[PDB]
Design a protein around this ligand. Structure first.
Ligand SMILES: O=c1ccn([C@@H]2O[C@H](COP(=O)(O)OP(=O)(O)O)[C@@H](O)[C@H]2O)c(=O)[nH]1
Ligand SMILES: O=c1ccn([C@@H]2O[C@H](COP(=O)(O)OP(=O)(O)O)[C@@H](O)[C@H]2O)c(=O)[nH]1
Ligand SMILES: [Mn+2]
Ligand SMILES: [Mn+2]
Lengths: 297, 297
């Protein structure tokens, strides 16, 4: 549940925090609005696991596998079983136009998977964008009654290392791996004022990735509905934002600041970007794909 | 109010966060449980002021002025008017055995003061300790219906610099200025197992000061009631914790981790400790006093 039951941590033995030693010297670990930026070295997972297990936390994970992207499910789910929220209650929600294509992946105790059938749009842009509507449609259907937090990710990915309760918070976004070191004017925000996703050149905190966001069910409902409604205004006006759902996500998180930000450890592409010294772990990574082949019949 | 009304920030122009530049190189700015540690340089007050003003936030400030400590009220309140939550709604709650001794301090718009008459205990230790019971007694009386957050401080103090909405969170404690650089075994926790405040030598995150804590009304109610109930168990067992309410506060915050920690900028004694380089601002500081004289007839 969320809202903090009154509970007490047990005695624990762990290293004392070091007030006069920074946990990272190379990166920003807190935003200007006092949201943690989650990097390895910022958290003691044992403390966090205790806190969230005592609250009996259930995490939902949404993933869309539409048309040829069903091919990504087996590795996605296998690796989620190794690395995502292990020890906590997990409910996977696989949205697909092909239920019979969902692989039979063996789940650990306390973990379940539901298949949600949805329609397939022709254009990959529309498939990607309509995730906001579909996630918002399923808050009342399932999520409010089944999970405490939702984590909403791309399927063309694999887990390689721990992704756990350190991410959980009312609202989070993830630093896009292409832009974490970039100046805001280089961010690929929507720059046309005729779109609802428009962000001027002198605004913006971060460039968040569309492939990994989440929060409490309430906050995810708000985000997804807002982004969908904004998309529909754009469609009525004959404009499609340059990066689709990601552009609208960025507008939303500029205006509604996240309560945690995940570092690019949580959203990476090793083929394109290697393994920089600033990433102590590569947690959730792109699986190589040929856009043209996989997005079209 | 608290619980986040759906609201949007206006357009704002401010410096871009620097992902690859730490906001402080000299101090820890986030705890191992991902609570911000509030130091100058960690926050953009303009963003935070927007967030909290859009939620129409009201902050209660409790202060006890019992027996001779009424002498501290005028400077406390005058300086709070200059530095505490300016621009936000504030409700001061002055607990005293002498209502006629509360000075007539001129308040800014949107700020009010209530005088709450309470009994005076003989021993200063009991006066200090019984604040927990009294704060807890006033959650149902006033606070739940009047304020969003409570800030609970010593009176023998003055504000010298900004203390604002950067502190606000469900539950906060403050690093005691005598111990922020100390190892845990040097912390003056209660070390006798026969007290409810007992903390073993291999446990503890920080040594929090009894003179400055707070949070949402709900969380402050929980803390104060727990500390009072623990005090009463100790009294029945013929033991008084070594540092009184501070010892019980430390036990509570070990077991129930705060969601922000304030640096010693927020609780300082310049006479005893000077102005170290690590303090960029001295915000809330001790007023010199002679313990023996001021605590006794
Ligand atoms: O034919 C498609 C196109 C997209 N997607 C979903 O939409 C997400 C976003 O698209 P994609 O991963 O192609 O975007 P990219 O990471 O390349 O920007 C995918 O991970 C899938 O979950 C899908 O299921 N089928
Ligand atoms: O006779 C007394 C003793 C204590 N206090 C209150 O209890 C707080 C804690 O006591 P004190 O400041 O003496 O503790 P110290 O800061 O010296 O540890 C004071 O700030 C007052 O708010 C009081 O009002 N009258
Ligand atoms: Mn993708
Ligand atoms: Mn004091």
């Amino acid at each position: 549940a969320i809202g903090e039951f009154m509970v007490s941590l047990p005695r624990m033995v762990y290293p004392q925090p070091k007030v006069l030693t920074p946990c990272r010297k190379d990166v920003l670990v807190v935003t200007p609005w006092l949201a943690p930026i989650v990097w390895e070295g910022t958290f003691n997972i044992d403390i966090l696991n205790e806190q969230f297990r005592l609250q009996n936390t259930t995490i939902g994970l949404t993933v869309f596998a539409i048309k040829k992207y069903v091919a990504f499910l087996k590795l996605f789910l296998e690796t989620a079983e190794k690395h995502f929220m292990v020890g906590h209650r997990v409910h996977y929600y696989v949205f697909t136009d092909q239920p019979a294509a969902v692989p039979r992946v063996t789940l650990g105790t306390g973990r379940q998977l539901s298949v949600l059938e949805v329609r397939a749009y022709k254009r990959w842009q529309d498939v990607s964008m309509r995730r906001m509507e579909m996630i918002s449609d399923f808050c009342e259907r399932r999520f409010l009654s089944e999970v405490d937090y939702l984590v909403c990710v791309d399927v063309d990915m694999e887990f390689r290392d721990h992704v756990g309760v350190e991410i959980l918070t009312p609202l989070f976004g993830t630093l896009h791996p292409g832009f974490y070191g970039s100046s805001r004017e280089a961010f690929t925000y929507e720059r046309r004022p005729q779109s609802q996703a428009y962000i001027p050149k002198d605004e913006g905190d971060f460039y968040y990735g569309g492939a990994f966001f989440g929060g409490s069910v309430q906050e995810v409902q708000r985000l997804t509905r807002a982004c969908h409604q904004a998309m529909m205004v754009d469609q009525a006006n004959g404009i499609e934002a340059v990066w689709h759902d990601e552009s609208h996500l960025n507008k939303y998180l500029l205006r509604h600041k996240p309560t945690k930000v995940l570092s690019p450890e949580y959203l990476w592409d090793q083929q394109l970007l290697g393994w920089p010294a600033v990433l102590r772990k590569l947690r959730f990574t792109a699986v190589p794909k040929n856009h043209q082949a996989v997005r079209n019949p």
